[PDB]
Write a protein that binds this ligand. Structure first.
Ligand SMILES: Nc1nc2ncc(COP(=O)(O)O)nc2c(=O)[nH]1
Ligand code: NA
Length: 254
Protein backbone atom coordinates (compact mmCIF):
# COMPACT_ATOMS: atom_id res chain seq x y z
CA UNK A 1 0.00 0.00 0.00
CA UNK A 2 1.81 3.06 -1.40
CA UNK A 3 -0.58 5.56 0.26
CA UNK A 4 1.07 8.88 1.09
CA UNK A 5 0.27 10.95 4.19
CA UNK A 6 -0.53 14.59 3.39
CA UNK A 7 -0.31 16.48 6.67
CA UNK A 8 -2.55 19.53 6.95
CA UNK A 9 -0.81 22.79 7.88
CA UNK A 10 -3.35 25.59 8.23
CA UNK A 11 -1.86 29.08 8.55
CA UNK A 12 -5.19 30.96 8.71
CA UNK A 13 2.27 33.23 14.20
CA UNK A 14 4.84 32.12 11.63
CA UNK A 15 6.90 30.47 14.35
CA UNK A 16 3.93 28.30 15.33
CA UNK A 17 3.49 27.14 11.73
CA UNK A 18 7.17 26.13 11.55
CA UNK A 19 6.79 24.17 14.77
CA UNK A 20 3.69 22.42 13.47
CA UNK A 21 5.41 21.58 10.17
CA UNK A 22 8.34 20.16 12.14
CA UNK A 23 6.01 17.99 14.22
CA UNK A 24 4.26 16.73 11.08
CA UNK A 25 7.63 15.78 9.58
CA UNK A 26 8.81 13.93 12.68
CA UNK A 27 5.55 11.95 12.92
CA UNK A 28 5.92 10.62 9.38
CA UNK A 29 4.23 12.98 6.90
CA UNK A 30 5.10 12.36 3.26
CA UNK A 31 3.75 15.78 2.19
CA UNK A 32 2.98 18.99 4.11
CA UNK A 33 -0.11 20.72 2.69
CA UNK A 34 0.13 24.44 3.50
CA UNK A 35 -3.04 26.50 3.29
CA UNK A 36 -3.98 30.05 4.21
CA UNK A 37 -7.66 30.35 3.19
CA UNK A 38 -10.19 28.76 5.51
CA UNK A 39 -12.87 27.11 3.40
CA UNK A 40 -15.11 26.37 6.42
CA UNK A 41 -18.84 27.12 5.93
CA UNK A 42 -19.01 30.43 7.77
CA UNK A 43 -15.73 31.87 6.44
CA UNK A 44 -15.82 34.77 3.98
CA UNK A 45 -13.04 34.50 1.35
CA UNK A 46 -9.82 36.49 1.54
CA UNK A 47 -8.00 38.07 -1.42
CA UNK A 48 -5.12 36.34 -3.17
CA UNK A 49 -2.84 39.12 -1.87
CA UNK A 50 -3.87 38.61 1.75
CA UNK A 51 -3.51 34.86 1.20
CA UNK A 52 0.06 35.29 -0.05
CA UNK A 53 1.13 37.62 2.77
CA UNK A 54 0.26 34.86 5.26
CA UNK A 55 2.22 32.25 3.31
CA UNK A 56 5.40 34.11 2.29
CA UNK A 57 6.71 34.34 5.87
CA UNK A 58 6.41 30.61 6.57
CA UNK A 59 6.69 28.84 3.21
CA UNK A 60 10.48 29.23 2.64
CA UNK A 61 11.35 27.68 6.02
CA UNK A 62 8.71 24.96 5.69
CA UNK A 63 10.07 24.08 2.25
CA UNK A 64 13.65 24.00 3.57
CA UNK A 65 12.80 21.90 6.61
CA UNK A 66 10.57 19.52 4.64
CA UNK A 67 12.97 19.03 1.73
CA UNK A 68 15.87 18.52 4.16
CA UNK A 69 13.80 15.62 5.53
CA UNK A 70 12.81 14.34 2.05
CA UNK A 71 9.23 15.45 2.67
CA UNK A 72 7.29 17.21 -0.08
CA UNK A 73 5.31 20.45 0.19
CA UNK A 74 1.85 21.16 -1.29
CA UNK A 75 0.22 24.58 -1.70
CA UNK A 76 -3.50 24.45 -0.90
CA UNK A 77 -4.92 27.35 -2.90
CA UNK A 78 -7.58 28.18 -5.44
CA UNK A 79 -5.51 31.12 -6.83
CA UNK A 80 -3.08 30.61 -9.72
CA UNK A 81 -0.85 33.50 -8.59
CA UNK A 82 -0.40 31.95 -5.16
CA UNK A 83 0.44 28.60 -6.76
CA UNK A 84 2.94 30.37 -9.03
CA UNK A 85 4.64 32.16 -6.13
CA UNK A 86 4.72 28.99 -4.04
CA UNK A 87 6.13 27.06 -6.99
CA UNK A 88 8.92 29.61 -7.33
CA UNK A 89 9.75 28.96 -3.68
CA UNK A 90 10.04 25.26 -4.46
CA UNK A 91 6.80 23.47 -3.54
CA UNK A 92 6.14 20.07 -5.11
CA UNK A 93 2.34 20.06 -5.49
CA UNK A 94 -0.45 22.43 -6.30
CA UNK A 95 -3.41 21.31 -4.22
CA UNK A 96 -5.92 23.16 -6.41
CA UNK A 97 -8.92 23.11 -4.12
CA UNK A 98 -10.73 25.21 -6.72
CA UNK A 99 -10.36 22.59 -9.44
CA UNK A 100 -9.34 25.15 -12.10
CA UNK A 101 -11.76 27.73 -10.74
CA UNK A 102 -8.90 30.11 -11.57
CA UNK A 103 -8.65 29.87 -15.40
CA UNK A 104 -4.90 30.59 -15.17
CA UNK A 105 -4.25 27.52 -13.03
CA UNK A 106 -3.53 25.19 -16.02
CA UNK A 107 -0.87 27.52 -17.43
CA UNK A 108 0.84 27.70 -14.02
CA UNK A 109 0.84 23.92 -13.56
CA UNK A 110 2.08 23.27 -17.09
CA UNK A 111 4.87 25.87 -16.95
CA UNK A 112 6.12 24.45 -13.65
CA UNK A 113 6.02 20.65 -14.20
CA UNK A 114 4.33 20.43 -10.78
CA UNK A 115 2.00 17.70 -9.66
CA UNK A 116 -1.53 19.01 -9.23
CA UNK A 117 -4.56 17.89 -7.21
CA UNK A 118 -7.93 19.06 -8.55
CA UNK A 119 -10.80 18.80 -6.04
CA UNK A 120 -14.52 18.58 -6.83
CA UNK A 121 -16.86 21.20 -5.35
CA UNK A 122 -20.28 22.84 -5.84
CA UNK A 123 -18.71 26.30 -5.64
CA UNK A 124 -16.48 27.95 -3.06
CA UNK A 125 -17.19 28.90 -0.35
CA UNK A 126 -19.58 26.09 0.48
CA UNK A 127 -23.27 26.86 0.91
CA UNK A 128 -26.33 24.88 1.93
CA UNK A 129 -27.96 26.37 -1.18
CA UNK A 130 -25.35 24.51 -3.30
CA UNK A 131 -25.71 20.91 -2.13
CA UNK A 132 -26.36 17.68 -4.00
CA UNK A 133 -29.78 16.01 -3.77
CA UNK A 134 -30.80 12.87 -5.63
CA UNK A 135 -29.40 9.41 -6.32
CA UNK A 136 -25.92 8.80 -4.88
CA UNK A 137 -24.70 6.94 -7.99
CA UNK A 138 -25.60 9.95 -10.15
CA UNK A 139 -23.55 12.19 -7.83
CA UNK A 140 -20.49 9.99 -8.36
CA UNK A 141 -21.03 10.06 -12.13
CA UNK A 142 -21.28 13.87 -12.01
CA UNK A 143 -18.09 14.20 -9.96
CA UNK A 144 -16.25 12.01 -12.46
CA UNK A 145 -17.48 14.03 -15.45
CA UNK A 146 -16.59 17.32 -13.72
CA UNK A 147 -13.06 16.06 -12.95
CA UNK A 148 -12.60 14.57 -16.42
CA UNK A 149 -13.43 17.91 -18.05
CA UNK A 150 -10.70 19.53 -15.94
CA UNK A 151 -8.20 16.76 -16.71
CA UNK A 152 -8.82 17.51 -20.40
CA UNK A 153 -8.21 21.22 -19.84
CA UNK A 154 -4.90 20.54 -18.09
CA UNK A 155 -3.59 18.10 -20.72
CA UNK A 156 -4.60 20.41 -23.57
CA UNK A 157 -2.67 23.23 -21.88
CA UNK A 158 0.49 21.15 -21.49
CA UNK A 159 0.15 19.34 -18.14
CA UNK A 160 1.55 15.82 -18.30
CA UNK A 161 -1.10 13.18 -17.59
CA UNK A 162 0.94 11.42 -14.88
CA UNK A 163 1.13 14.60 -12.77
CA UNK A 164 -2.67 14.98 -12.30
CA UNK A 165 -4.34 13.80 -9.06
CA UNK A 166 -8.12 13.60 -8.54
CA UNK A 167 -9.98 14.42 -5.30
CA UNK A 168 -13.80 14.10 -4.91
CA UNK A 169 -13.99 16.89 -2.32
CA UNK A 170 -15.76 15.13 0.54
CA UNK A 171 -18.07 17.51 2.35
CA UNK A 172 -17.98 20.20 -0.40
CA UNK A 173 -21.69 20.48 -1.09
CA UNK A 174 -22.00 16.81 -0.09
CA UNK A 175 -24.12 15.87 2.90
CA UNK A 176 -22.70 13.17 5.21
CA UNK A 177 -24.60 10.27 3.57
CA UNK A 178 -23.24 11.25 0.15
CA UNK A 179 -19.67 11.71 1.43
CA UNK A 180 -19.74 8.20 2.92
CA UNK A 181 -21.15 6.83 -0.35
CA UNK A 182 -18.23 8.36 -2.28
CA UNK A 183 -15.63 7.06 0.19
CA UNK A 184 -17.18 3.57 0.06
CA UNK A 185 -17.06 3.64 -3.75
CA UNK A 186 -13.68 5.37 -4.13
CA UNK A 187 -12.53 2.47 -6.32
CA UNK A 188 -14.80 3.72 -9.11
CA UNK A 189 -12.89 7.01 -9.15
CA UNK A 190 -9.62 5.05 -8.98
CA UNK A 191 -10.66 3.07 -12.08
CA UNK A 192 -10.07 6.23 -14.13
CA UNK A 193 -6.35 5.44 -13.90
CA UNK A 194 -5.30 8.64 -12.10
CA UNK A 195 -3.95 8.82 -8.54
CA UNK A 196 -6.61 9.82 -6.03
CA UNK A 197 -6.47 12.11 -3.00
CA UNK A 198 -9.11 11.93 -0.27
CA UNK A 199 -9.64 14.58 2.42
CA UNK A 200 -11.92 13.00 5.02
CA UNK A 201 -10.09 14.16 8.15
CA UNK A 202 -12.41 15.55 10.86
CA UNK A 203 -15.04 16.33 8.19
CA UNK A 204 -18.69 16.84 9.07
CA UNK A 205 -19.46 13.48 7.42
CA UNK A 206 -18.51 12.06 10.83
CA UNK A 207 -21.52 13.80 12.37
CA UNK A 208 -23.49 10.87 10.92
CA UNK A 209 -21.67 8.55 13.29
CA UNK A 210 -22.52 10.83 16.22
CA UNK A 211 -18.87 11.87 16.73
CA UNK A 212 -18.37 15.54 17.58
CA UNK A 213 -15.59 17.53 15.93
CA UNK A 214 -13.12 17.43 18.82
CA UNK A 215 -13.03 13.60 18.92
CA UNK A 216 -12.82 12.85 15.20
CA UNK A 217 -9.15 11.90 14.75
CA UNK A 218 -9.65 8.27 15.87
CA UNK A 219 -12.78 7.80 13.67
CA UNK A 220 -10.83 9.45 10.84
CA UNK A 221 -8.08 6.83 11.25
CA UNK A 222 -10.66 4.02 11.06
CA UNK A 223 -11.72 5.28 7.63
CA UNK A 224 -8.08 5.98 6.71
CA UNK A 225 -7.40 2.24 7.06
CA UNK A 226 -10.22 1.42 4.62
CA UNK A 227 -9.12 4.08 2.13
CA UNK A 228 -5.53 2.82 2.27
CA UNK A 229 -6.82 -0.70 1.55
CA UNK A 230 -8.53 0.71 -1.58
CA UNK A 231 -5.07 1.98 -2.72
CA UNK A 232 -6.03 5.65 -2.37
CA UNK A 233 -2.83 7.44 -3.27
CA UNK A 234 -3.01 10.43 -0.91
CA UNK A 235 -4.77 10.98 2.43
CA UNK A 236 -5.10 14.60 3.58
CA UNK A 237 -5.21 14.39 7.36
CA UNK A 238 -4.70 16.35 10.56
CA UNK A 239 -3.26 13.52 12.69
CA UNK A 240 -0.25 12.14 10.83
CA UNK A 241 0.72 9.64 13.57
CA UNK A 242 -2.67 7.90 13.54
CA UNK A 243 -2.69 7.88 9.74
CA UNK A 244 0.69 6.16 9.70
CA UNK A 245 -0.80 3.48 11.96
CA UNK A 246 -3.81 3.15 9.65
CA UNK A 247 -1.57 2.59 6.62
CA UNK A 248 0.62 0.04 8.40
CA UNK A 249 -2.52 -1.89 9.36
CA UNK A 250 -3.74 -1.78 5.75
CA UNK A 251 -0.33 -3.13 4.68
CA UNK A 252 -0.70 -6.05 7.09
CA UNK A 253 -4.11 -6.87 5.56
CA UNK A 254 -2.64 -7.31 2.06
N1 LIG B 1 -7.50 18.37 -1.97
C1 LIG B 1 -8.22 18.76 -0.91
N2 LIG B 1 -7.99 19.95 -0.37
C2 LIG B 1 -8.79 20.33 0.69
N3 LIG B 1 -8.51 21.55 1.17
C3 LIG B 1 -9.26 21.91 2.22
C4 LIG B 1 -10.26 21.13 2.77
C5 LIG B 1 -11.15 21.60 3.89
O1 LIG B 1 -10.83 20.85 5.09
P1 LIG B 1 -10.06 21.50 6.35
O2 LIG B 1 -10.89 22.69 6.82
O3 LIG B 1 -10.14 20.43 7.44
O4 LIG B 1 -8.66 21.87 5.97
N4 LIG B 1 -10.53 19.92 2.27
C6 LIG B 1 -9.82 19.48 1.23
C7 LIG B 1 -10.03 18.16 0.59
O5 LIG B 1 -10.89 17.35 0.93
N5 LIG B 1 -9.18 17.90 -0.46
NA1 NA C 1 11.72 15.88 -1.62
Amino acid sequence: VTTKIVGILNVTEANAAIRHATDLIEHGADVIDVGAESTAPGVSPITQEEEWSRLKEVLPEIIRIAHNAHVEVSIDTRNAKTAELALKLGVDYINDQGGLLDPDMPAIAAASSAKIIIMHHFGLPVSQDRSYVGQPEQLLNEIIEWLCSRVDTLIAQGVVRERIILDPGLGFGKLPEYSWYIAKNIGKLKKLGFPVCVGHSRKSMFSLIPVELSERDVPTAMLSTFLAQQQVDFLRVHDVKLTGISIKIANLLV
